[PDB]
Design a protein around this ligand. Structure first.
Ligand code: POV
Ligand code: POV
Ligand code: POV
Ligand code: POV
Ligand code: POV
Ligand code: POV
Ligand code: POV
Ligand code: POV
Ligand code: POV
Ligand code: POV
Ligand code: DU0
Ligand code: CLR
Ligand code: M05
Ligand code: M05
Ligand code: CA
Lengths: 632, 172, 39
């Protein structure tokens, strides 16, 4: 495999081609395509970097290759089975891609690349206007390699858990210094991230140096409030921290416990940052609850100032998260941060607060007895509504637990699914409300109170209220005797039908909906919860040590983690990989050639043969004795 | 494409006729909701006339659907059209309206302070009950969706199935 | 007495008997070659 041959393999029409490769060559060159165009590997590299996304950089687009390519051993490649795997996948040649995948090294990595490349071509095929979409074909090819990567990880995990966790985090050096666990996140390949092995790793990254089988959360919270109790905690040895990726400054300190080291290990663990923010967030709500319930004067109280400080500094910390994320382009930094329910809510919560502060604070205190100054009122009322956002953000903290977190994810999924049942209920409501109002209140002029009256009491009927003494307004126990008139005897009949429909049909249908959909939503929600632990835990490695009142100093002073292996440990790891791939194919053949469906049929074939042979004996064996009848 | 062709393709697509009827049907209910909640005088309002026009012309369009169906014999044209829940309901809704219009409109306005004229009252009260039919027809439009439509069909099937449990409850 | 166990010991014997009939099929040819040659 040389460069000129590998050119020809992309530039050939004498075989099954991908019609959409050329449609991708255009977009990376932005318009230019002569009819006699011979594809070049510089142009293939730009397709790959486009498809793989992020900050991926192919070896075709580097200084070393661009020179030797223009110049033209050296035209060879060191790893040609990688160059052909990409070819077979860009050309939509799955049977060739599977074959070439089995040959070479780094099998689990190559499978996660292939999953990514097909997934990205499937998306462009949706977004493009062609005769055959081919996208369910490519989406099928992506999930085939994705299933292989998962099956190899389970194989490695059953052999050695610690070495399997190392496999998720070593750099690859032929795949743009990337990581198998990063490639799977890029493809949203969830059974791999929801797998026991990498959940075990995220839980060890959560600890840091802290050994949290001996310790308990009683003593971490204590040690945050009682700093000198940091010294009486059990930590981990460098040997126990070997499969865990670390920062530069971390490994230095682990390499050299000294007193100052034992503090550093504590305040830079993600678990400690969590509780150290959590406690500050709860102290925040207590005050903002005190401020909103207690009378507010012209000048803010000491409680209110502390609240303004937190939200101001909290907002600053959200800006840096945007402009320091894994995506390298702004528009990607934006869309991904707004892909989280509670980051959207914090954006509204922050913006709405300072509107309210502006009115509350920038209001001209014409003394009148406040709540005669209506600009002050609007400011305070925005606070009273904004605090709802900050209670609901507690569900973000609570979802860190294994039991609570999936239920928090179910609540969103079920609101989406119960939508149309609730639309029908809202129709039954108006079907009742409009006649009830029209019959009982005929002498009315137009007003926006009509819009409340057709909707108000019918809604409250769903929730256990009957308005017993308002039914039959002409009765003696009625509370609406001025409303008795012609045609009011109809409204009890109407309401009897209304509640029959809402409870006996529609509430119980909704109960029946949930009972019959609970399991598969719960199952999806557990996998989704596990996939998102990654984005959650990997953020705390980048967050500062101080929480959002005192973080301001960490910002001013300020103005990823990597897995390190010595060479013998890289050697032991590449051997672990090869061995576990061999075991995988072997056990696959054995299970196949040990099943009844496979033994019945190879028996079926031999018996068919042996039938022919005994006949091929039966004719001949007659023909033996004919001598001892004739020769004799 | 030619300009006039590109309009023809639009106004003769079934999706476009649907939303173009749907929006007119919603504008219809808004007015008939305004008419039924706001005080009614001797002479109909501009809102009420528009409502009478829609139901009159709506009725005409239902007649042609009957006499232009795939069945070629009248008695088959009839039975098949009445095989739909909401076409039966529209038949009652249309007939009941013009009874109410007759009383509301053909009533001798002996001035007395209306709601002393009891023929006017019956007319108005039929409107207030007839509008229920026209909210429930919105379930016919909503059943065009894949998620909502089956639930609309379940509601009918379950009323039929829960019948005897409800008879026992009525006995208790 | 189970099918998974009877299918497989059947699977093994049939593999053996295939070898034997062949170990007959070569030999049984080699019998009649007398009554073509000896005769
Ligand atoms: C927010 C970000 C940082 C996070 C930490 C924040 C904590 C900061 C801590 C303390 C700061 C408190 C302010 C001091 C005010 C003293 C004023 C005084 O004289 O005495 C006051 C005592 O104070 C009160 O009554 C105020 C209510 C206390 C609420 C405490 C909740 C949070 C505690 C944290 C728990 C966290 C535990 C972890 C979670 C489980 C008397 O009341 P008053 O206020 O004068 O009443 C108004 C009367 N007037 C206007 C007529 C005069
Ligand atoms: C990652 C994404 C999330 C984060 C995004 C960050 C978004 C930031 C959030 C929100 C910014 C936008 C909200 C609008 C601002 C207030 C407007 C207002 O009402 O002004 C008022 C006056 O103003 C004052 O009296 C001055 C006080 C306001 C300055 C402090 C808040 C805004 C500045 C930024 C601070 C936060 C910066 C945070 C740094 C990041 C006008 O009302 P008034 O004068 O009372 O009118 C009548 C007066 N009269 C009665 C005398 C006639
Ligand atoms: C001066 C006062 C100071 C002290 C007071 C303050 C004390 C602190 C406050 C509360 C006590 C909480 C203790 C729970 C910890 C148990 C251990 C555990 O398993 O943790 C899990 C919980 O992980 C979380 O993140 C839980 C959520 C945090 C608190 C949420 C506040 C809002 C809840 C209230 C809203 C309703 C309110 C209505 C009623 C008022 C995570 O672990 P796991 O995934 O199961 O796996 C084990 C992993 N690990 C152990 C290595 C982490
Ligand atoms: C008034 C007349 C009646 C109307 C009222 C209506 C009220 C409604 C109000 C509020 C409900 C709004 C929730 C919308 C969520 C939609 C997003 C979603 O589907 O899930 C996403 C977020 O996943 C999560 O985990 C989100 C968790 C948020 C919980 C918020 C609860 C707020 C409680 C407030 C308490 C305050 C109460 C007191 C206030 C004073 C996950 O996305 P997905 O997985 O792709 O989802 C597809 C799902 N599917 C494929 C299964 C279909
Ligand atoms: C269902 C089987 C048949 C059963 C038996 C027969 C029942 C069936 C038919 C007929 C019964 C209708 C007449 C009842 C009159 C008695 C009340 C009365 O005296 O006057 C009434 C006035 O009312 C009117 O002026 C007209 C009322 C009827 C018009 C609306 C028809 C609604 C039902 C049509 C569709 C139904 C179909 C539903 C099918 C499921 C009430 O007013 P008042 O009492 O005079 O109040 C005076 C107050 N003041 C002193 C302040 C001024
Ligand atoms: C139905 C079949 C066709 C379908 C379209 C129908 C639409 C036709 C459109 C417009 C026609 C409106 C009639 C004009 C009357 C003007 C009178 C006047 O001077 O001003 C009036 C303004 O008008 C009102 O207040 C009437 C209420 C408006 C209801 C609009 C709902 C439908 C809008 C369509 C939305 C569709 C959107 C799509 C759906 C999402 C003042 O009030 P009034 O009435 O004088 O009050 C009685 C007072 N008096 C008796 C004491 C004097
Ligand atoms: C596909 C199947 C579905 C479609 C089927 C179609 C079915 C059509 C639907 C219904 C038709 C049958 C309903 C009955 C008619 C009203 C009777 C009535 O009350 O008259 C009243 C008077 O009448 C008037 O004052 C004249 C106004 C009525 C004419 C307009 C409606 C009927 C004509 C057809 C228009 C729609 C045609 C639509 C074209 C298709 C009598 O009441 P009164 O005079 O007040 O009595 C006392 C008076 N006093 C106080 C002075 C003593
Ligand atoms: C297919 C069928 C089509 C034809 C239907 C034909 C039906 C047409 C029927 C009848 C026409 C009647 C007109 C004349 C009435 C004579 C009485 C009178 O004048 O005065 C009396 C009116 O008292 C009433 O109750 C009148 C209203 C009852 C009508 C009920 C209709 C039911 C429709 C059901 C819907 C069916 C829908 C079915 C759809 C499938 C007394 O009142 P007053 O003197 O005016 O008041 C002065 C009182 N003061 C002392 C307070 C001042
Ligand atoms: C000036 C003002 C103008 C604008 C305002 C008016 C805006 C319009 C009004 C409402 C917004 C509706 C938007 C839905 C469309 C989504 C696309 C879709 O999938 O369509 C589906 C919905 O098909 C239907 O037919 C839906 C029902 C129509 C509206 C029903 C009104 C009654 C509901 C209210 C009752 C409760 C009321 C209580 C609360 C008030 C059909 O498609 P599908 O089978 O899923 O497959 C896709 C096929 N397709 C896309 C090719 C079609
Ligand atoms: C008061 C004391 C208590 C009594 C009150 C009782 C009240 C009852 C009132 C109303 C309920 C009446 C519905 C009857 C439907 C029967 C037809 C049917 O079975 O389905 C058919 C139509 O299929 C559909 O999809 C029909 C959908 C119509 C929904 C109407 C809801 C009205 C809501 C109104 C809201 C207004 C509320 C406010 C008003 C002011 C399909 O036929 P099928 O598939 O062959 O069915 C066989 C089923 N099986 C084989 C499974 C067995
Ligand atoms: C499908 C859905 C059902 C039907 C429906 O929605 C769609 O159709 C809408 C039409 C609405 C009315 C249109 C115009 C006005 C005039 C306005 O006049 C100000 C007077 C005074 C205020 O103090 C200042 O002078 C008052 C409100 C009113 C009557 C609307 C009420 C709500 C109605 C009935 C709505 C109803 C819920
Ligand atoms: C219509 C306007 C003018 C009046 C007030 C509207 C009501 C419905 C508004 C005001 C405050 C709002 C709440 C503010 C905050 C949140 C938290 C969020 O996670 C879910 C929605 C939720 C719970 C909102 C629901 C709708 C809400 C209750
Ligand atoms: N952050 C959440 C919850 C969570 C999960 C795990 C831990 Cl360890 C802690 C908290 C809550 C928002 N969510 C989300 N928001 C919006 N749309 C979505 N689509 C998929 C997931 C989400 C993603 C998880
Ligand atoms: N028209 C409906 C609902 C519907 C279905 C599909 C679309 Cl795309 C739009 C609306 C509502 C009445 N129905 C019906 N009515 C009475 N008896 C029956 N037996 C079987 C069906 C029906 C037939 C479907
Ligand atoms: Ca109750």
């Amino acid at each position: 495999l040389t460069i000129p041959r590998l050119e020809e393999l992309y530039n050939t029409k004498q075989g099954p081609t991908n019609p959409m490769l050329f449609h991708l060559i255009r977009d990376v060159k932005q318009g230019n395509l002569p009819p006699g165009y011979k594809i070049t590997l510089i142009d293939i590299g730009l397709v790959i970097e486009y498809l793989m996304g992020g900050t991926y950089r192919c070896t075709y687009t580097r200084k070393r290759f661009r020179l030797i390519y223009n110049s033209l051993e050296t035209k060879r490649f060191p790893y040609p089975l990688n160059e052909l795997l990409i070819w077979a996948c860009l050309m939509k040649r799955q049977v060739m891609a599977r074959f070439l995948w089995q040959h070479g090294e780094e099998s689990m990595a190559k499978a996660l690349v292939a999953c990514k490349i097909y997934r990205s071509m499937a998306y462009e095929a949706k977004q493009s206007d062609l005769v055959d979409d081919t996208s369910e074909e490519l989406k099928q090819y992506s999930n085939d390699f994705g299933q292989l990567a998962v099956e190899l990880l389970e194989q490695s995990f059953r052999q050695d858990e610690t070495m399997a966790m190392k496999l998720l985090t070593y750099e690859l050096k032929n795949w743009s210094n990337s990581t198998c666990l990063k490639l799977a996140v890029s493809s949203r390949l969830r059974p791999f991230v929801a797998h026991t092995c990498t959940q075990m790793l995220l839980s060890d990254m959560w600890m840091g140096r802290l050994n949290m089988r001996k310790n308990s959360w009683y003593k971490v919270i204590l040690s945050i409030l009682v700093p000198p109790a940091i010294l009486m905690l059990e930590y981990k040895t460098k040997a126990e921290m070997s499969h865990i990726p670390q920062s530069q400054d971390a490994h230095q300190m682990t390499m050299e416990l000294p007193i100052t080291r034992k503090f550093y290990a504590f305040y830079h663990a993600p678990i400690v940052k969590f509780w150290f923010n959590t406690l500050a967030y709860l102290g925040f709500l207590m005050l903002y609850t005190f401020v909103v319930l207690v009378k507010m004067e012209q000048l803010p109280s000491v409680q209110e100032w502390i609240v303004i400080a937190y939200i101001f500094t909290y907002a600053i910390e959200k800006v840096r998260e945007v402009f320091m994320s894994e995506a390298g382009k702004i528009s990607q930094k934006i869309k991904v941060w707004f892909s989280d329910y509670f980051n959207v809510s914090d954006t509204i919560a922050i913006i709405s607060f300072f509107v309210g502060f502006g009115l509350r604070f920038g209001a001209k205190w014409n003394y009148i007895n406040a709540y005669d100054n209506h600009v002050f009122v609007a400011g305070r009322l925005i606070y009273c509504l904004n605090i709802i956002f900050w209670y609901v953000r507690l569900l973000d903290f609570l979802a860190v637990n294994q039991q609570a977190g999936p239920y928090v994810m179910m609540i969103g999924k079920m609101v989406a699914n119960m939508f149309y049942i609730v639309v029908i209920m809202a129709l039954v409501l108006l079907s009742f409300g409009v006649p009830r109002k029209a019959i009982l209140y005929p002498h009315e002029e137009p007003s926006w109170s009509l819009a409340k009256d057709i909707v108000f009491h019918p809604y409250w009927m769903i929730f256990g209220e009957v308005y017993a003494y308002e039914i039959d307004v002409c009765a003696n126990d009625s509370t609406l005797p001025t409303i008795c008139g012609p045609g009011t005897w109809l409204t009890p009949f109407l309401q009897a039908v209304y509640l029959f429909v809402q409870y006996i049909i529609m509430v119980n249908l909704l109960i029946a909906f949930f009972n019959n959909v609970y399991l598969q939503v719960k199952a999806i929600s557990n996998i989704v919860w596990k996939y998102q632990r990654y984005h959650f835990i990997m953020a705390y490695h980048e967050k500062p040590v101080l929480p959002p009142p005192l973080i301001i100093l960490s910002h001013i002073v300020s103005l990823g983690p990597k897995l390190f292996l010595t060479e013998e440990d890289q050697k032991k790891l590449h051997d672990f990989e090869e061995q576990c791939v061999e075991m995988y194919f072997d056990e696959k053949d054995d299970k196949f050639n040990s099943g009844s469906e496979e033994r019945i049929r190879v028996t079926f074939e031999r018996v068919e043969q042996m039938s022919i042979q005994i006949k091929e004996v039966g004719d001949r064996v007659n023909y033996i004795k004919r001598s001892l009848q004739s020769l004799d």
